[PDB]
Symmetry: D2
Subunit: 317 residues, 4 copies
Amino acid sequence: DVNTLTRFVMEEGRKARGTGELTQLLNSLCTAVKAISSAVRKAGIAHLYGIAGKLDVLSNDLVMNMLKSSFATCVLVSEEDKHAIIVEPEKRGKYVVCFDPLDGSSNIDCLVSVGTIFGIYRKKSTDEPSEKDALQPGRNLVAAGYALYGSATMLVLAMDCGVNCFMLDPAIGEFILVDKDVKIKKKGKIYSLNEGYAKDFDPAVTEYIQRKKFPPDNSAPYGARYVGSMVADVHRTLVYGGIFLYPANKKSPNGKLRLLYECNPMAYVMEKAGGMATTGKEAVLDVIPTDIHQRAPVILGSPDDVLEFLKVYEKHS
Amino acid sequence: DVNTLTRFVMEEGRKARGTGELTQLLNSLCTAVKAISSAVRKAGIAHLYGIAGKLDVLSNDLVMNMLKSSFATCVLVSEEDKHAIIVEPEKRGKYVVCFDPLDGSSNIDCLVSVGTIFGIYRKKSTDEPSEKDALQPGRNLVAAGYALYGSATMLVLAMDCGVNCFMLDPAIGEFILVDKDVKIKKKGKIYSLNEGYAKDFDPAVTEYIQRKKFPPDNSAPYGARYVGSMVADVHRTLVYGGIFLYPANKKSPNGKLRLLYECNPMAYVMEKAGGMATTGKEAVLDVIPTDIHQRAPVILGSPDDVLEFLKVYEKHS
Amino acid sequence: DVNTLTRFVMEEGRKARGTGELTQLLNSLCTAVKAISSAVRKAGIAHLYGIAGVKKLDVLSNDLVMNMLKSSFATCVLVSEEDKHAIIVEPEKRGKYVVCFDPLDGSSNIDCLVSVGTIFGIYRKKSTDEPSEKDALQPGRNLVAAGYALYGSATMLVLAMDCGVNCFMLDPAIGEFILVDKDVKIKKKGKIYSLNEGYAKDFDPAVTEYIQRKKFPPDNSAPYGARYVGSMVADVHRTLVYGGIFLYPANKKSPNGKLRLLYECNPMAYVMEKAGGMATTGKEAVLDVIPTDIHQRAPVILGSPDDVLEFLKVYEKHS
Amino acid sequence: DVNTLTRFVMEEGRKARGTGELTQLLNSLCTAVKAISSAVRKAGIAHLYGIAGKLDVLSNDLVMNMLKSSFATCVLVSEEDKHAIIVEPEKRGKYVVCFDPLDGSSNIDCLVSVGTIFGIYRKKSTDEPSEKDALQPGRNLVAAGYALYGSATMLVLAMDCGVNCFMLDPAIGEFILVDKDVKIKKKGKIYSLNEGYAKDFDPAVTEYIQRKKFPPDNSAPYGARYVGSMVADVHRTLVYGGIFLYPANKKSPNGKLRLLYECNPMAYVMEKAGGMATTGKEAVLDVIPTDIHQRAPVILGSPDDVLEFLKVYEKHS
Ligand SMILES: COc1ccc(S(=O)(=O)NC(=O)Nc2ncc(Br)s2)cc1CC(C)C
Ligand SMILES: COc1ccc(S(=O)(=O)NC(=O)Nc2ncc(Br)s2)cc1CC(C)C
Ligand SMILES: COc1ccc(S(=O)(=O)NC(=O)Nc2ncc(Br)s2)cc1CC(C)C
Ligand SMILES: COc1ccc(S(=O)(=O)NC(=O)Nc2ncc(Br)s2)cc1CC(C)C
């Protein structure tokens, strides 16, 4: 029996007998994704080239306006905005949203995969809303996931029950449930990182990657893939299994990916799909942030693979 | 002044006072590309999931039927077919087409970019048409290029005058010229190959890669990218500069990519854009093929970079 | 601030503190409307013509609404112009609402690309019996909501409920219905009459006179304009936008008219009244007719209040 | 075998061994139709209503810009512009185009069918082009037709060979040939006119209309339809047979429809499909215009039905 994103959310929202504020947020966000996807596929570009005589910025304004107008949000953190946005009081609701509205948008001249990442928190403090409400640890996530604008446009939603994937049919503007309660492979055969920083790698990364190119039990070497747009690399990891690594180098001693709206949402999706996500020292979701644009090193993916790396990490102290 | 692929080809076709058979072929191919794009973006997928109670095969049939019915082709070589297809005589025309109808479609489960690669030859003899007509070297190409099914749909077309890029506007089904006469950077900063099989690297490849991660002059190391879908990795190389390598080792002395419908059209686009493409021993376009599904190693991209690789390659011989 | 149909329905659903079953109904219906529009615009017809070497549009439309409603968990009885007997939803998918619909009205003339539409009416199941066709035999007064999708130059969804009539434009780049006309109200008097004057030979005498009074005013004012698309959804919606009167009246060859009460006349009458208009059979208001069979017909004259009145004067003038 | 509008125009154009200037015209015109369809279906209206915080005028600018840039036009007459536009010398070509880019658009608030009507004449003089070049009779048409934006978008193209109908598949932006070499019914069962102006009907019109409601041979009365958009009413007449009448009354002794870009193109389709079009006094195509915006009464459709009208017209003088 067929199921849609809006219909899955409403069925789940009634089963839990909640108020609907979260559904309204999800519906508003889903609508922005459909608009962003329309622009990413360059629909309507002919008028820009004078047929009748800022893609990351447009994405940002789409998500800002659609979330502000859902009456369901109070603090919004975006990669595009230096400070958190504090929703004006008349439109204020109970939720905090952190998002990268167009991840990979720097490599968009090459039509690389791009994506939207989002994380949803229930405001915890009872103070007047401020940036501090967006500083919760990943454990506190109520919902998170991403839209991948690839060969097709897909939405991955992870909440308490698990992870579900919806394929956007652009013919009707509706998201079709195509993968119910997805689970990552226990062990993959692919490693994913930018090996250009090999000169700046921590030795454990060097040992684990060396173990993938020349396996010690003389098994088959892993394949390498690295798109360089995080949604694309993480999503492949989810669908095919394996391990993704953006560790700390010298240009980024605290890692390069942003914790609030890049690492934690992927870490939540991974964990709710049976995978693991670590900074090296601790699980990603346990990190308590202090700044909205702070970075974190991240290694995530299949349980056996992330565990194997963790053994290598302890070996080097 | 606004310009489309259909309008552009007619302009070049009149300026050259040709018969129109080539323009008819390109228009048919472009229409097949738009039809492929709609399915890759999963338009109408709602009906496959029972809303009222094969993707590379469909691609192959679209190009085949659109080429056969253009009245401009006589022999068609496709990745999907063991033997070359001979157009029935009533629909027979003066051109030979080699294509991969959907390259990278094996990784399409994760929505990575996919593409169609095509190369066009003029039939040289007046014999009865046979596979012998497909075995020209890349030097003989009249037009060649690819469609990238990425974040957007782009058609890159390389003919004698040079390389031009068209963006598909899906609201109107027209390819909008957005890049006239592209030329690749003289030297790039990205290396692109599957470093997972380092255990089996030919030694020159090993050394070339180490020099990219660890420059002896302590200049900047290159970044690594590898989508693992050929159209995507090559198009990025064209847009950003750099080098793509699917090289020969000893386990596969001829590489893995197919010469007729993968290596030659990319070599043509690269060379027509100021780039280089070698197998290590010779330019890709100089190879005289003996079997339509034969393999060839390929290293392509910026001239300074292909030259540097070849400098390392002669060293290990 | 921008507004979409899905967002508008949820707002009203919370404001009224309902269970959500009705919102789930309209959203599923909205989705079926979007899919119909995709097919009506012949998206993918190139594959139908062997571009790589399935049903008829009104059959497929019916399947879409049926399947989208059955799976909404908000319906128990479905009556369709396409199905002779009312459908009783299986118990697991069973809900508390009864739906009458015309899935593709006017589809007979679609070979000429005339406007076509989906019409729907939504009732609450009143009795506590096991659900049966009888639950569909409620009068139009009992409607919870009603409206129609018009697949014309654009695809517009008109939703009429107690609070009023709202119009949504389908933006196909994103597949969302955009609130574009809030709280619509029909003109008190129009300048258009709409009916099939080819069958004048069989006109009820009041109609013959009323049309003469619109073409040759006794008060020697300006004549009314004539328009008749012949697709009910198109003609009624124009009357809503420009004012005037629409007539599919009763003659002697068809003393009860030809249009169907449950899923054509009642939903159009419901929209008309919630927008300040009128809909009468001549003898009684359309919404007051108590149906005895799900496919029974009824004459309908609707449009601006003043114009339906002038007709009623002439109708009662003819005893 | 599948065939598109562009491929069909190229085939007939090659068979005639022409320069391509007409094919270039039609391709550019077809692309503007595709753009108007997208806007008329209100694609992208969500941004018009502030999702991130003029339709006939847009229609004209599209056709104007698309025709000027085809390098195939010299004089353009449009319903929207009081004087003919004279294409600038660098973009000049050998064809004259009269069009209504968005006919019936005054009724677009109710989502009535609208259309684009066009007629194409060869430049008459070799002098400096001027309005006199558009003042040719309908007999001189090289090609003419219309795009109907109704429940679907269809292109009706009438040239010397006949009339062919193309359906726009908006999923791929190509017009698909769906009716070859169409011919109108010899006699229909529908008449189509505005009986609201009955007060001023020419007596012949009154008598012919009475003859349709009350047949002397006690056959079936004709059915009545009148959408009020000429393209919609004319296309129905072509597809189902019957008669469309916008005749001369006392309120308008020369009719109200415009002869160059409404009556002349529709009469041509009618004649090329086996139908007829008269003003009452003469064939529409034989009227030589004196001013580009002159009006003409028109009665068109199936031949036997127009003949029955013409008998009554000759009877009444
Ligand atoms: C466990 O999942 C949930 C729990 C609560 C909520 S909620 O607080 O928004 N409640 C509601 O929406 N109630 C409703 N009433 C009428 C309607 Br129709 S929906 C939503 C979800 C779904 C999300 C996770 C996709
Ligand atoms: C140098 O470029 C070309 C040379 C020949 C050809 S052709 O053989 O197809 N001739 C024609 O098309 N003639 C026409 N006359 C009128 C029309 Br309208 S088209 C096409 C191209 C363009 C391609 C390569 C982009
Ligand atoms: C006044 O109109 C209504 C009355 C009841 C209903 S309802 O029974 O469906 N309740 C709900 O939907 N509750 C919800 N809870 C959470 C969410 Br989020 S929506 C809906 C409407 C809206 C109109 C447009 C149909
Ligand atoms: C009567 O049919 C025609 C007569 C002349 C012309 S034309 O002057 O445009 N010639 C050409 O286009 N030649 C070409 N050369 C290369 C190509 Br590829 S097409 C076109 C048509 C067909 C149209 C009207 C559908």
